[PDB]
Amino acid sequence: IQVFLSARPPAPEVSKIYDNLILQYSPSKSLQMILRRALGDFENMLADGSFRAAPKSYPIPHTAFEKSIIVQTSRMFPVSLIEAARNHFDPLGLETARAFGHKLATAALACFFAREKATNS
């Protein structure tokens, strides 16, 4: 099924990849490029449950040099994997679709950024 997703760009120095992308693309385009790869990587982690050991969030900017940006997107996921995601991110079944999509995208990115840091980018 189609899952709607949302995320905020990271603070400077959280992601060398993101910081370089924004030299040439908008924050929105740059984050969408990263999320495509991050969600691909994350899908494979949903399949085996390893995603529950992954970081949940990342630092966001709190500077007058940075305005509020929330990026909105959608992506198709197998229903089996989204069930696994929902069981973890929505353990009581009380989160809205939008809140779930924010949690899912944010975790996927948090994982991508931690991998960057751990591999010296």
Curated annotation (Swiss-Prot):
The keyword Iron-sulfur does not apply. One of its GO terms (molecular function) is DNA binding. GO terms for biological process: regulation of DNA-templated transcription. It comes from the Bacteria. Keywords: Crown gall tumor, Plasmid. The Ti plasmid contains at least six transcriptional units, designated vir loci, which are essential for efficient crown-gall tumorigenesis. This is Protein virC2. The lineage of its organism: Bacteria, Pseudomonadati, Pseudomonadota, Alphaproteobacteria, Hyphomicrobiales. The chain holds residues 82 to 202 of 202 of the full protein.
